[PDB]
């Protein structure tokens, strides 16, 4: 049966990692962002010794870098920064080919389209804003907007058409259809701020959870609340796995990695069970991220290190 | 500091005064509080939250 074993963990950080991403046209690379004020681009060794090494650390920051995507074609990457500003970097040397200048105060979110034309960026501004990859603004939204900090959008995989998610800390998640920029509903739940949102591969659904923990569910198109689940005390990040229909909820002392059809959760993955006193005795997962192939998971935590999981049957 | 004259002597007037603005204008002395500078508390806090789905 389907079930997890502990693959290994990688090492070369000085601050909390805060997100992973990876490319699907590369999966030998992995891409990491951390609270030492740096993106490491990584040379992943498939031996058990180790599981691999930093190749080169992009640098150039002098506040924590957020939240980091990849490109569609894994040549270019892209940052958001607690400096109010976003880098666009070749990611062959190092190189920024722009920096985008223009916000008052933090970049928590940020996301790259699937065209490669239109990026967005969330701000404790309590605006978000679209972006040119000239390095211009397209759009600023500032009207129907968060009444506090916007926790983390979305690009949503679609047939043709343009919408994005938006959810903010005024416990809300707003929906936005491009050329008209109008909220396409208003989904209102869960009791606490809104951590992060997630979107379907194949595009019709929102995972949403926060300080409640909760994971409730939305429809996209449908516009209806499908249900709601206990994920536990918080859920800080989420992410669908790409080859099936499962969600991995990222909660303190664990990982929760749950089937949707039934619902039900699988296992819950355990680290090191070291024995330290009393505030959080492992470190909080906050971060994780899914390879392409499906067999292997990653996770950031507080303690600098990314914890590297396989799917066993 | 004022010097004033009588038949005896001299006497010394001298005046302290401490201006009162913290809310806002002239701008004139600056807003925080001197002595013990205060932390300017607003408040709001309310919720009535339930799921629901709204279009718009």
């Given at each position: 049966?389907?079930?997890?074993?502990?693959?290994?963990?990688?090492?070369?950080?000085?601050?909390?990692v805060?997100?992973?991403?990876?490319?699907?046209?590369?999966?030998?690379?992995?891409?990491?962002?951390?609270?030492?004020?740096?993106?490491?681009?990584?040379?992943?060794?498939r031996?058990?010794?180790?599981?691999?090494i930093?190749?080169?650390?992009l640098?150039?920051?002098?506040?924590?870098?957020?939240?980091?995507?990849?490109?569609?074609?894994?040549?270019?990457?892209?940052?958001?920064?607690?400096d109010?500003?976003?880098?666009?970097?070749?990611?062959?040397?190092?190189?920024?080919?722009?920096?985008?200048?223009?916000?008052?105060?933090?970049?928590?979110?940020?996301?790259?389209?699937?065209?490669?034309?239109?990026?967005?960026?969330?701000?404790?501004?309590?605006?978000?804003?679209?972006?040119?990859?000239?390095?211009?603004?397209?759009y600023?939204?500032?009207?129907?907007?968060?009444?506090?900090?916007?926790?983390?959008?979305?690009?949503?995989?679609?047939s043709?058409?343009?919408?994005?998610?938006?959810?903010?800390?005024?416990?809300?998640?707003?929906?936005?259809?491009?050329?008209?920029?109008?909220?396409?509903?208003?989904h209102?739940?869960?009791?606490?701020?809104?951590?992060?949102?997630?979107?379907?591969?194949?595009?019709?659904?929102?995972?949403?959870?926060?300080?409640?923990?909760?994971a409730?569910?939305?429809?996209?198109?449908?516009?209806?609340?499908?249900?709601?689940?206990?994920?536990?005390?918080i859920?800080?990040?989420?992410?669908?796995?790409?080859?099936?229909?499962?969600?991995?909820?990222?909660?303190?002392?664990?990982?929760?990695?749950?089937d949707?059809?039934?619902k039900?959760?699988?296992?819950?993955?355990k680290?090191e069970?070291?024995?330290?006193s009393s505030?959080?005795?492992?470190?909080?997962?906050?971060?994780?991220?899914?390879?392409?192939?499906?067999?292997?998971?990653?996770?950031?935590?507080?303690?600098?290190?990314?914890?590297?999981?396989?799917?066993?049957? | 500091?004022?010097?004033?004259?009588?038949?005896?002597?001299?006497?010394?007037?001298?005046?302290?005064?401490?201006?009162?603005?913290?809310?806002?204008?002239?701008?004139g002395?600056?807003?925080?509080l001197?002595?013990?500078?205060?932390?300017?508390?607003?408040?709001?806090?309310?919720?009535?939250?339930?799921?629901?789905?709204?279009?718009?």
């Open positions: 049966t389907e079930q997890m074993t502990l693959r290994g963990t990688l090492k070369g950080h000085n601050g909390w805060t997100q992973i991403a990876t490319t699907p046209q590369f999966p030998d690379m992995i891409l990491s962002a951390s609270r030492d004020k740096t993106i490491i681009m990584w040379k992943l060794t031996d058990e010794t180790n599981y691999g930093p190749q080169r650390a640098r150039g920051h002098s506040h924590f870098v957020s939240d980091v995507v990849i490109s569609s074609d894994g040549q270019f990457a892209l940052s958001g920064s607690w109010g500003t976003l880098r666009l970097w070749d990611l062959t040397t190092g190189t920024t080919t722009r920096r985008f200048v223009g916000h008052t105060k933090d970049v928590l979110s940020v996301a790259f389209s699937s065209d490669n034309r239109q990026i967005v960026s969330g701000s404790r501004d309590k605006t978000i804003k679209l972006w040119n990859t000239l390095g211009v603004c397209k600023t939204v500032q009207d129907e907007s968060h009444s506090e900090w916007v926790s983390c959008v979305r690009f949503s995989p679609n043709s058409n343009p919408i994005i998610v938006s959810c903010g800390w005024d416990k809300l998640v707003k929906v936005w259809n491009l050329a008209n920029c109008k909220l396409k509903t208003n209102i739940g869960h009791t606490g701020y809104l951590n992060t949102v997630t979107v379907s591969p194949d595009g019709s659904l929102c995972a949403s959870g926060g300080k409640d923990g909760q409730m569910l939305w429809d996209l198109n449908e516009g209806k609340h499908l249900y709601t689940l206990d994920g536990g005390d859920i800080n990040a989420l992410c669908f796995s790409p080859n099936r229909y499962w969600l991995c909820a990222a909660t303190g002392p664990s990982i929760k990695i749950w949707l059809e039934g039900i959760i699988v296992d819950e993955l680290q069970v070291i024995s330290t505030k959080a005795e492992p470190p909080q997962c906050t971060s994780l991220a899914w390879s392409a192939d499906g067999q292997t998971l990653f996770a950031g935590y507080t303690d600098n290190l990314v914890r590297v999981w396989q799917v066993t049957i | 500091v004022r010097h004033v004259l009588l038949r005896q002597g001299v006497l010394g007037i001298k005046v302290k005064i401490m201006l009162p603005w913290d809310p806002s204008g002239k701008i002395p600056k807003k925080p001197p002595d013990h500078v205060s932390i300017v508390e607003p408040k709001d806090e309310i919720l009535p939250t339930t799921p629901i789905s709204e279009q718009k």
